[PDB]
Amino acid sequence: RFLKVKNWETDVVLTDTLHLKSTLETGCTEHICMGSIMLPSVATKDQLFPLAKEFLDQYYSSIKRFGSKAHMDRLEEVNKEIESTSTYQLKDTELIYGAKHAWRNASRCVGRIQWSKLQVFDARDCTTAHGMFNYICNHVKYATNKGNLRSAITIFPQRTDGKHDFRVWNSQLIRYAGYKQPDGSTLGDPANVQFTEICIQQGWKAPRGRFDVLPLLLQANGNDPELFQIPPELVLEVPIRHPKFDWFKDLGLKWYGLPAVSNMLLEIGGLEFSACPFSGWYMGTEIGVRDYCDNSRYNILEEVAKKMDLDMRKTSSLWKDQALVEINIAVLYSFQSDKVTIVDHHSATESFIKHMENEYRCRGGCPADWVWIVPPMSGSITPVFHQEMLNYRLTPSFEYQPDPWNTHVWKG
Amino acid sequence: RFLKVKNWETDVVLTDTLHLKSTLETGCTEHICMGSIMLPSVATKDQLFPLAKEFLDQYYSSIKRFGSKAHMDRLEEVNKEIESTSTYQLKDTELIYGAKHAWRNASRCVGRIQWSKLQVFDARDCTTAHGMFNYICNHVKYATNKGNLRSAITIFPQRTDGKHDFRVWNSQLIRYAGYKQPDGSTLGDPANVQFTEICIQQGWKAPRGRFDVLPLLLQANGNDPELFQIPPELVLEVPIRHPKFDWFKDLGLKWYGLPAVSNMLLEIGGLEFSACPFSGWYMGTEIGVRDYCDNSRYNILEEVAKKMDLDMRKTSSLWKDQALVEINIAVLYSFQSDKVTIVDHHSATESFIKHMENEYRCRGGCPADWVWIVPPMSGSITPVFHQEMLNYRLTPSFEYQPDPWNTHVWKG
Numbered sequence: 051r052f053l054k055v056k057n058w059e060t061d062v063v064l065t066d067t068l069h070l071k072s073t074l075e076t077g078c079t080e081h082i083c084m085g086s087i088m089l090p091s092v093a094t095k096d097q098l099f100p101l102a103k104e105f106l107d108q109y110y111s112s113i114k115r116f117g118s119k120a121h122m123d124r125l126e127e128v129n130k131e132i133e134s135t136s137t138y139q140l141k142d143t144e145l146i147y148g149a150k151h152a153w154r155n156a157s158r159c160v161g162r163i164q165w166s167k168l169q170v171f172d173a174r175d176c177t178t179a180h181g182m183f184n185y186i187c188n189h190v191k192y193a194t195n196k197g198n199l200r201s202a203i204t205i206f207p208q209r210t211d212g213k214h215d216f217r218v219w220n221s222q223l224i225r226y227a228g229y230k231q232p233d234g235s236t237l238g239d240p241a242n243v244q245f246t247e248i249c250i251q252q253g254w255k256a257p258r259g260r261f262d263v264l265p266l267l268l269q270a271n272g273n274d275p276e277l278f279q280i281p282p283e284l285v286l287e288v289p290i291r292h293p294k295f296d297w298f299k300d301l302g303l304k305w306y307g308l309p310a311v312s313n314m315l316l317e318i319g320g321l322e323f324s325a326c327p328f329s330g331w332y333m334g335t336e337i338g339v340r341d342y343c344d345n346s347r348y349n350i351l352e353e354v355a356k357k358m359d360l361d362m363r364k365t366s367s368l369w370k371d372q373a374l375v376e377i378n379i380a381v382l383y384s385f386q387s388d389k390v391t392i393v394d395h396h397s398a399t400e401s402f403i404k405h406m407e408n409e410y411r412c413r414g415g416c417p418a419d420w421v422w423i424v425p426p427m428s429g430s431i432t433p434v435f436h437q438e439m440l441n442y443r444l445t446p447s448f449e450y451q452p453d454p455w456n457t458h459v460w461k462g
Numbered sequence: 463r464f465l466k467v468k469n470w471e472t473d474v475v476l477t478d479t480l481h482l483k484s485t486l487e488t489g490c491t492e493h494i495c496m497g498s499i500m501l502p503s504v505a506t507k508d509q510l511f512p513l514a515k516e517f518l519d520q521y522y523s524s525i526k527r528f529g530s531k532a533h534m535d536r537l538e539e540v541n542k543e544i545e546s547t548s549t550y551q552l553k554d555t556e557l558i559y560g561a562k563h564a565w566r567n568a569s570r571c572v573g574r575i576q577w578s579k580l581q582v583f584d585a586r587d588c589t590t591a592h593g594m595f596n597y598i599c600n601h602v603k604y605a606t607n608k609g610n611l612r613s614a615i616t617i618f619p620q621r622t623d624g625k626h627d628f629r630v631w632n633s634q635l636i637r638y639a640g641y642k643q644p645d646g647s648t649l650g651d652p653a654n655v656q657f658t659e660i661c662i663q664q665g666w667k668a669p670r671g672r673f674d675v676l677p678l679l680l681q682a683n684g685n686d687p688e689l690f691q692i693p694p695e696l697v698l699e700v701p702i703r704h705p706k707f708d709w710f711k712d713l714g715l716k717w718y719g720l721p722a723v724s725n726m727l728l729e730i731g732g733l734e735f736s737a738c739p740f741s742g743w744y745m746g747t748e749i750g751v752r753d754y755c756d757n758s759r760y761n762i763l764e765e766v767a768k769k770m771d772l773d774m775r776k777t778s779s780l781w782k783d784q785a786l787v788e789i790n791i792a793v794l795y796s797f798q799s800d801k802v803t804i805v806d807h808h809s810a811t812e813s814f815i816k817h818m819e820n821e822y823r824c825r826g827g828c829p830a831d832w833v834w835i836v837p838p839m840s841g842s843i844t845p846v847f848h849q850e851m852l853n854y855r856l857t858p859s860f861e862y863q864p865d866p867w868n869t870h871v872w873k874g
């Protein structure tokens with residue numbers, strides 16, 4: 051009832067009781083562990099009050115007024131509004147708390163040491179896709195902050211019935227387009243090929259090149275979504291050069307500064323915000339390992355091996371690893387020389403260990419998904435590899451949701 | 463009741479029903495996942511017959527005679543012997559099947575494609591520590607096979623009462639000694655420091671150097687354990703050189719050829735074999751990443767960085783990664799140039815994916831522990847990073863057991 055997580059590189063032990071607050075289910079059972087399944091898995095007014103009460107009880111317990119006068123009245127206020135409207139509305143302060151804690155509880159996030167420094171943009175007065183575009187542009191500009199990146203989230207109106215849904219159809223505000231070829235291969239980002247042709251469907255005019263920034267596809271209040279192109283002055287990009295290999299520029303590689311995921315659902319006291327794009331800054335490996343070196347992504351280990359004078363015949367020459375380290379020294383160096391915020395997987399994972407100690411101290415635990423926290427290269431030389439982690443689903447939370455084109459009752 | 467695991471680098475999907483046979487518990491619940499906990503957690507004659515029956519039912523179902531004449535008689539034979547002796551004895555063939563399947567079910571093992579080619583040495587007639595030494599020496603010689611390594615396991619008598627236990631006190635048959643220093647630091651292998659002084663306790667005379675092979679500490683039939691030194695001609699060692707950097711020899715590094723874990727418990731039809739050393743061959747990373755570059759192990763990233771002309775001031779120069787790749791090219795190259803069997807983490811993980819497909823095909827699944835299967839470097843450029851895995855505990859199995867010095871009722 052009070053479980054222990056050990057670190058095996060430092061012999062450090064912490065005791066988890068925060069998992070007792072856990073409510074949702076993990077997909078694991080007593081006889082099966084699903085901690086490597088990628089995505090394991092309309093509401094009524096009955097269900098809504100325990101979720102609202104539970105949330106309000108932790109919000110007022112966090113401003114040091116649990117069960118006090120303001121809390122019992124807010125309880126009644128929301129109870130009455132859920133009887134009346136079969137839903138309710140969060141205070142600005144409750145929205146900001148809920149957002150920061152959804153991040154704080156995101157067990158797959160290695161960057162959560164920053165969770166309390168999150169800028170919450172309340173876009174709950176938005177009514178149209180143009181309104182959404184405007185809010186998103188201000189989000190991008192604000193979070194980019196000329197390379198001194200700042201964490202932010204923009205929260206569009208919550209789901210009501212279910213057919214009046216606000217959705218960003220992009221999986222990230224800033225993504226490079228993916229184009230299939232005659233010979234089957236892929237220019238640009240193979241991840242986004244289907245989306246890059248959904249945009250062409252709704253009317254995008256593709257500049258069929260490499261690092262072409264995709265347009266926004268914004269659905270407001272359930273209406274069919276509409277295309278908007280982010281002003282290119284708002285999309286900050288870092289050209290990737292190496293601090294030794296001058297042929298690295300000839301590779302002609304660049305990535306965007308702002309990782310801003312836009313396809314997930316924010317849940318706060320039973321309220322479902324289906325459009326809530328949030329951004330931080332990149333950890334180096336997400337670009338230099340996964341974006342660049344994934345087989346089904348940019349898949350550039352070919353060239354980086356070549357130009358380095360590498361033994362590509364033998365699988366065991368570790369030419370794949372050797373080009374992988376250089377690519378990540380190059381993204382880091384390129385980003386830092388342009389004063390664009392980036393964190394290397396060593397500093398980010400040490401920060402997470404530090405963050406984990408803070409959580410267990412003042413909170414009683416820190417839900418963490420080892421499978422996602424360990425970086426996708428050099429795993430065991432980072433401190434998180436050796437750190438046992440308990441994963442469990444606290445709320446408020448970010449949750450996956452299906453892509454909107456699989457679910458949307460179209461009409462136009 | 464019929465779960466699906468997906469690969470996300472190939473979009474390949476397999477269906478797991480083998481988990482329905484699963485019996486033991488995983489440590490996870492519906493509300494907590496412990497898949498990153500390192501070690502989560504005397505028998506009676508009542509418990510023994512279902513375990514014996516279950517095992518016999520799968521053994522006879524494997525030689526294509528399930529429920530037939532020989533099976534129902536063997537059932538009765540073991541039933542009668544568990545009534546009589548409150549235990550029982552495995553046939554040579556049942557022992558070999560049980561052993562191979564404990565390996566086959568070891569969800570943390572990436573090398574299981576070889577599980578059916580396991581050499582089972584039956585040492586159940588052993589009575590003394592000298593007998594154990596003899597069996598172990600023949601094991602080492604056989605499995606080493608002059609560098610053309612062969613998988614093997616030696617199975618000492620099963621636990622009976624609990625105070626007459628056969629145990630190898632070494633965690634591996636071949637381990638380098640670890641000596642603390644005046645200035646606190648460590649010569650040799652810091653992992654084994656406590657064992658390296660337990661040997662000195664029982665009378666070892668330490669050649670306090672680096673790669674000093676430890677003596678065996680063999681406990682037979684519950685008696686106090688005794689020291690034996692493996693003939694050095696039986697301990698095959700690979701000097702580590704790099705195929706580019708001639709200062710790599712000056713590092714003066716070597717590892718033993720034979721990974722042969724000796725501290726675990728083999729469980730077969732409810733029978734507990736507390737001493738069952740088993741060996742295969744090293745995957746490169748266990749030496750070049752964990753053994754060499756772990757903080758609390760040989761911790762040699764210092765020098766390999768230095769001699770390479772590396773920027774060690776900045777954490778973000780990825781000097782740690784850069785020395786790590788070279789070290790692993792060097793272990794691989796050194797082992798292969800000496801015709802000593804070694805497998806690189808690329809081939810071993812591709813083989814495991816191939817093996818996984820075989821299992822789901824002819825068996826209905828393959829218990830796999832993602833946390834342990836993904837190699838500790840370059841995780842996402844190997845195919846297992848992108849492979850969802852269901853972990854569950856089948857039997858026969860290898861299980862952890864406490865170190866014998868924490869449990870042994872001494873007397874001498």
Ligand code: HEM
Pocket residue numbers: 152153156158159160161162164168201202203328329330331332333336393398422448
């Ligand atoms: C401030 C800098 C940040 C860094 C360095 C960071 C780092 C990461 C990384 C490396 C991942 C793994 C995702 C992948 O590998 O594809 C991740 C996931 C995640 N991040 Fe953070 N992040 C940051 C900010 C944020 C913010 C501001 C939020 C929310 C407001 C957030 C919420 C999440 C969530 C919910 C996930 C997991 C979602 C899933 O299940 O896929 N992060 N983060």
Ligand code: HEM
Pocket residue numbers: 564565568570571572573574576580613614615740741742743744745748805810834860
């Ligand atoms: C044939 C070559 C083999 C290779 C390349 C191999 C590879 C590995 C690796 C890399 C690990 C992870 C352990 C660690 O990282 O410290 C492992 C674990 C394991 N291996 Fe294999 N292995 C081989 C043979 C065998 C054999 C012959 C057996 C049993 C008879 C076996 C049973 C196990 C078990 C039970 C574990 C996990 C034990 C635990 O929970 O710590 N392996 N193996």
Ligand SMILES: Cc1cc(N)nc2cc(-c3ccc(CCN)cc3O)c(F)cc12
Pocket residue numbers: 158309310311328329330331332333336
């Ligand atoms: C705020 C943030 C910052 C960052 N630096 N990186 C992030 C990565 C993801 C993310 C991206 C893709 C996938 C699916 C494929 N891996 C899961 C994710 O969590 C995310 F949501 C948010 C991120």
Ligand SMILES: Cc1cc(N)nc2cc(-c3ccc(CCN)cc3O)c(F)cc12
Pocket residue numbers: 570721722723740741742743744745748
């Ligand atoms: C047969 C075999 C082959 C190999 N090539 N490697 C192996 C590694 C381990 C092993 C070693 C240490 C630990 C604890 C610290 N990691 C767990 C293990 O499973 C093991 F048992 C067996 C192995």
Ligand SMILES: C[C@H](O)[C@H](O)[C@H]1CNc2nc(N)[nH]c(=O)c2N1
Pocket residue numbers: 085086087088421422423470847848849850851
């Ligand atoms: C199969 C596995 O669940 C999947 O590849 C996961 C593993 N861990 C990950 N970890 C991070 N940070 N990002 C990912 O995309 C993944 N992918």
Ligand SMILES: C[C@H](O)[C@H](O)[C@H]1CNc2nc(N)[nH]c(=O)c2N1
Pocket residue numbers: 058435436437438439497498499500833834835
């Ligand atoms: C904390 C974590 O459970 C621990 O470090 C595990 C992670 N995965 C591992 N995987 C392998 N192959 N070997 C290990 O020692 C470990 N250690």
Ligand SMILES: [Zn+2]
Pocket residue numbers: 078082083084085490494495496497
């Ligand atoms: Zn689990």
